[PDB]
């Protein structure tokens, strides 16, 4: 059917935060359920973000794999809404041969923050049917002085009869954006823009840094322009000509970070203009990147000390049934409740992902059956034709000899 670029997402269901006005949890809403402690902690963190009075605080979310911390982060992002900057990037994007390493994290931070500004401009127009001065108008006509580029340009301009672009009366620039008030058939406004320091610096860096924005080419901009633009931003804040809206940042798989990365993070967090930061990682005690040190989640102890943690817990049976039903209706698939129960069992033994996977396969199998309701037989057949982690591991273990190195 008609589709946009986006399609059914792995975590599309969420749309917000199942949170009470008092930062308290409601058992099921907004596409997410359970994990109430993390829910309240995330509400508190989001309230911190809204206030934004503190500078560069950091938090981390732990928990065994499967617990949808990314789900929580995306819920946070939706709760923030399309008004404040938010940046999400996995751990491996940090390694880029184009630029150095510290440069990449510094650019990430300077991109996360956000500066807002509103501006005004008077623009009025007259309904000029003839494209040729004689600024033909229906409201009030003008024969104001004549330029040169405007005269030689508007005369040869191609426009329909009665059409009236919102031309710049204050300037005369040919701004082909507006339409005809009545000829074919004014507001100074407050044009509001969102910008980050990663934008200002690159714009001022050279003649056409805006090209470098899209090209993703610039590397290692000197810290001098950075500090000068920080001073400029501060002295614009003081004078009221500009305002700041401190954004946020998200990272994932921080376990896959070098020790130098952690040290640079420890320094940079100390800075003033640091947007709030959020983390994510699953494993428990593990080796740190670059050495043999086993550390909790493979994070340096000093970095952990200056950081907070929040945990998650597995899903009970009825929690699993709730998630299953919400994602089953989300995909628009309707089951026989015996199928719901048997699938819920299976999901409890195997995993959450396996069930979220099997639902659509069962739907298609039934479509081939030509019915609209899937029963246990179809699910058992699907589970027979495709395998989970444990079953595949075993099957290898019978064919271990066939598979090389085993």
């Amino acid at each position: 059917d008609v589709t946009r670029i986006e399609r059914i997402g792995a975590h599309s269901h969420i749309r917000g935060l199942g949170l009470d006005d008092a930062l308290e949890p409601r058992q099921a809403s907004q596409g997410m359920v359970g994990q109430l402690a993390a829910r309240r902690a995330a509400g508190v963190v989001l309230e911190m973000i809204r206030e934004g009075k503190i500078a560069g605080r950091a938090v981390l979310i732990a928990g065994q794999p499967g617990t949808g911390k990314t789900a929580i982060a995306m819920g946070m992002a939706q709760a923030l809404g399309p008004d404040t900057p938010f940046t999400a990037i996995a751990g491996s994007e940090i390694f880029s041969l184009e630029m150095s390493k510290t440069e990449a994290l510094t650019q990430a931070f300077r991109r996360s923050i956000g500066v807002r500004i509103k501006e005004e401009t008077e623009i009025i127009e007259g309904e000029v049917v003839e494209i040729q001065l004689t600024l033909k108008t229906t409201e009030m006509e003008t024969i104001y002085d004549l330029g040169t580029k405007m005269i030689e340009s508007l005369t040869k301009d191609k426009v329909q009869a009665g059409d009236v672009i919102t031309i710049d009366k204050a300037t005369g620039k040919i701004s082909k954006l507006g339409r005809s008030f009545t000829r074919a058939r004014q507001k100074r406004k407050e044009v509001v823009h969102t910008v980050s320091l990663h934008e200002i610096d690159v714009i001022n860096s050279r003649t056409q840094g805006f090209l470098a924005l899209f090209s993703g080419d610039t590397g290692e901009i000197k810290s001098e322009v950075r500090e000068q633009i920080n001073a400029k931003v501060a002295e614009w804040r003081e004078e009221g000509k500009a305002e700041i809206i401190p954004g946020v940042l998200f990272i994932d798989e921080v376990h896959m970070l070098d020790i130098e990365s952690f040290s640079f993070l420890n320094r940079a967090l100390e800075s003033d203009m640091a947007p709030v930061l959020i983390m994510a990682t699953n494993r428990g005690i593990t080796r740190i990147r670059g050495t043999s040190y086993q550390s909790p989640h493979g994070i340096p102890i000093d970095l952990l000390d200056r950081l907070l943690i929040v945990s998650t817990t597995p899903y009970s049976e009825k929690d699993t049934k709730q998630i299953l039903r919400i994602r089953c209706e989300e995909e628009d698939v309707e089951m026989s409740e015996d199928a719901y129960t048997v699938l819920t069992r299976i999901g409890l033994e195997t995993s959450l992902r396996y069930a979220i996977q099997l639902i659509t396969a069962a739907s298609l199998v039934c479509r081939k059956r030509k019915g609209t309701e899937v029963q246990v037989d179809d699910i058992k057949r699907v589970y027979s034709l495709f395998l989970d982690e444990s079953r595949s591991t075993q099957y290898m273990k019978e064919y271990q000899d066939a598979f090389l190195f085993n």
Binding site: D1, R7, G9, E98, K156, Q208, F214
Partner: protein, 425 residues
């Protein structure tokens, strides 16, 4: 006819409408489980709605996993896009491998566009360069004649076209592409050895605008925007002349492109068509690659991915100490389907041998078939298949046509398997 590869017999999954796997069809045999599973996957992609699902294959080496992917492609027709690659190509000397993966994902999807386009051509009558901007060009064609204002850019283009009059050109307003078609055919007699050729006056109107079903990938949209070869400003020209080095593409460009494509779809002109990405030897990927796959598969726009591996629980690339089933990290393994593969027996070997012999069209003795099946039972199947051409050459040189046991044994002592070498090494 063009040469014939090992995987040329494959033409179709060989299933039946009911959803079952016929034993012999479209060049496939056995593995009814795998064939029906591939049927399920092809139906899933035919849904054209699901995004982000992923699958993996496994089994004994040389069981046709590549053949399964190829047969999926066969039954998929041509409309849907498709893309293969391997773990090795992820490593590059131009940009980070993360960007390689993301570019692959971008080009997996396809797009189709119905495009206006406006053309202008004819015979050059005049060229009056009045005031640069006022460059009016008079064009003659069988229909008639017209003369229109010009852009000094196209003026320079015409200058570089080396055209004065009585010659044929071709102007497209959109691209501004300027082009010459030699000289008019009217002047086919003035001289006798004048070098430049001649073509006749156009038989149509100077103006014409025709629609076209153009198709492009989102990757190409991104790249075309990134390095603006278009435009003509001298600053742009200088940007162009610099060395063509590929650069990592900022994601803000990606987001703006997504917005613009949404607007285009809202115009109803363009319709989307996602593709399927096949990756071979995924085990060759490192730990970072799987780390980035974890996030990449999450996107709401990621097409369907496939993998392949023929390895047991061995050490993990880029990890050098942890061992995981097939070498793929257990966490990523948790995120994927699994489809397995069996082994075969002598009868299936005889079947496939007959299929290949037909594929290359060679008469053979049934006794040779029996002996070759025995050899394949001893050796690997690929070794059995490789013996066909030397047997055919032996048959032809000696003047006979069908292959016999003598030729089979001759080739046998000519060439030997890996295990034979090892035992004699």
């Amino acid at each position: 006819t063009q040469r014939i590869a090992s995987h040329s017999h494959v033409k179709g999954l060989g299933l039946d409408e009911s959803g079952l796997a016929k034993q012999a069809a479209s060049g496939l045999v056995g593995q009814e489980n795998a064939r029906e599973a591939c049927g399920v996957i092809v139906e899933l992609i035919k849904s054209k709605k699901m995004a982000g699902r992923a699958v993996l294959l496994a089994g004994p080496p040389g069981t046709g996993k590549t053949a399964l992917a190829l047969a999926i492609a066969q039954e998929l027709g041509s409309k849907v896009p498709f893309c293969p690659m391997v773990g090795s190509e992820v490593y590059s000397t131009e940009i980070k491998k993360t960007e390689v993966l993301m570019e692959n994902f971008r080009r997996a999807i396809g797009l189709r566009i119905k495009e206006t386009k406006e053309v202008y051509e004819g015979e050059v009558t005049e060229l009056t360069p009045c005031e640069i901007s006022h460059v009016i060009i008079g064009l003659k064609t069988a229909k008639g004649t017209k003369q229109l204002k010009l852009d000094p850019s196209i003026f320079e283009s015409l200058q570089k076209e080396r055209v004065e009059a009585g010659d044929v050109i071709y102007i497209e307003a959109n691209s501004g592409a300027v082009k010459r078609q030699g000289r008019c055919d009217t002047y086919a007699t003035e001289f006798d050895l004048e070098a430049e050729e001649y073509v006749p006056l156009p038989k149509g109107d100077v103006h014409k605008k025709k629609e076209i079903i153009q198709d492009v990938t989102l990757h190409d949209l991104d790249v075309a925007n990134a390095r603006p070869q278009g435009g003509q400003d001298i600053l742009s020209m200088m940007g162009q002349l610099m060395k063509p080095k590929k650069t990592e593409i900022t994601d803000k460009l990606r987001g703006e492109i997504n917005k613009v494509v949404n607007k285009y779809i809202d115009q109803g002109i363009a319709e989307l068509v996602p593709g399927v990405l096949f990756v071979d030897e995924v085990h060759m990927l490192d730990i970072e690659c799987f780390t980035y796959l974890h996030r990449a598969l999450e996107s709401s726009i990621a097409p369907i991915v496939i993998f392949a591996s023929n390895r047991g629980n061995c050490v993990i690339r880029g990890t050098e100490d942890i061992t995981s089933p097939h070498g793929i990290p257990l966490d990523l393994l948790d995120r994927v389907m699994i489809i397995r593969t069996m082994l075969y027996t002598p009868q299936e070997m005889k079947q496939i041998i007959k299929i290949r012999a037909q594929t290359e069209g060679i008469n053979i003795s049934e006794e040779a078939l029996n002996h070759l099946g025995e050899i394949g039972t001893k050796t690997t199947l690929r070794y059995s298949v490789q013996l066909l051409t030397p047997a055919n050459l032996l048959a032809k040189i000696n003047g006979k046509d069908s292959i016999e046991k003598e030729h089979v044994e001759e080739i046998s002592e000519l060439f030997y398997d890996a295990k034979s070498s090892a035992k004699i090494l």
